[PDB]
Amino acid sequence: ESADLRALAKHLYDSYIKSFPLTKAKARAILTGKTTDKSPFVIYDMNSLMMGEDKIKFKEVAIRIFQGCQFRSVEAVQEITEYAKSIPGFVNLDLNDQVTLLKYGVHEIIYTMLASLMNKDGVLISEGQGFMTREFLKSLRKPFGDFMEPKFEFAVKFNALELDDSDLAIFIAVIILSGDRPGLLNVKPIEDIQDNLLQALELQLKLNHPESSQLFAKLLQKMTDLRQIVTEHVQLLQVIKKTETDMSLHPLLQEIYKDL
Ligand SMILES: CCCCCCCCC(=O)O
């Protein structure tokens, strides 16, 4: 029945709120400087990174920015893992499959959600107290300058669909439960859940965005851009592991990469 899927759409939206402090809705309130529900300090040059630590809670600059972005990713994983637990069925799967689903799944969700924190011109840093311009990032030293850039590229395409937090909650739940993923001992239970989630996503898209012709199809197509961006990410990473074999990396970010 439609009613059953509607109930699942709501259950996941509830957990999404509970698990992600910076909603897309909060983000686009901060970004659209109209509603000064607290406006961000912005960082656009080296000499403004200073008052970023002056006014905001947060070893060469380009490295220290990169480490700070890497730290927001472990926090992003922690939250994503918290959200998965709530997807009905998930905790019931084989444990080894729970991990692989997360191993491949988190990154794709990192950048889906990061799109909420972006406009064409920059990205919210530091829970929303900051805003760092895409140009300052692009201007960084050359093993880091073009690191974040293809994220802005994806975000601008993706932001165009203009999704809700209530749509994203079902969409990120789909991404997690792929079955497409290498090493899954047990695929059909994963696939059975995802087909029910794609039902929830489909329906929700039609109710929440009716005049938006074939958004469901257009959304699922954006998973093409997602995969491709995670891949040039890991190759960008392994390069920094040899340009600065003195720079560390969080262990929980280590496990996301058994490459090849
Ligand atoms: C540290 C709070 C996490 C939110 C975005 C992280 C960006 C922080 C930074 O790059 O300095």
Author numbering: 207 to 264, 275 to 476
Publication passage describing the model:
We solved two new crystal structures of PPARγ bound to GW9662 and SR16832, an analog of GW9662 that we developed with a ligand extension that weakens synthetic ligand binding to the alternate site, at 2.29 Å and 2.73 Å, respectively. Similar to our edaglitazone crystal structure, we observed electron density consistent with a bound bacterial MCFA in both structures, which we modeled as C9. In the SR16832 structure, C9 is present only in chain A; and the 6-methoxyquinoline group extension in SR16832, relative to GW9662, appears to have blocked the branch II C9 binding mode, pushing the C9 closer to the cobound position in our edaglitazone structure. Compared to wild-type PPARγ or GW9662-bound PPARγ, we found that C9 binding was more potent for SR16832-bound PPARγ despite the bulkier addition in SR16832, relative to GW9662, that points towards and blocks the branch II C9 binding mode. Inspection of the SR16832 crystal structure cobound to C9 indicated the increased potency is likely due to hydrogen bonds between the aryl ether/methoxy group of SR16832 with the carboxylate head group and other aliphatic protons in C9, the latter of which can form weak hydrogen bonds with methoxy groups. In support of this hydrogen bond network, we performed density functional theory (DFT) calculations, which revealed a net attractive interaction between C9 and the SR16832 methoxy group (10.3 kcal/mol) and a repulsive interaction with the phenyl moiety of GW9662 (8.56 kcal/mol).
Thiazolidinediones (TZDs), also called glitazones, are synthetic agonists of the peroxisome proliferator-activated receptor gamma (PPARγ) nuclear receptor with potent anti-diabetic efficacy in patients with type 2 diabetes. The PPARγ ligand-binding pocket is among the largest in the nuclear receptor superfamily, ranging from 1200 to 1400 Å3 in crystal structures with three branches described as ‘T’ or ‘Y’ shaped. Branch I is located proximal to helix 12, which forms a critical part of the activation function-2 (AF-2) coregulator binding surface; branch II is located near the β-sheet surface, close to the predicted ligand entry/exit site where helix 3 meets helix 6 and the helix 11/12 loop; and branch III is also located near the β-sheet surface but deeper in the pocket near helix 5.
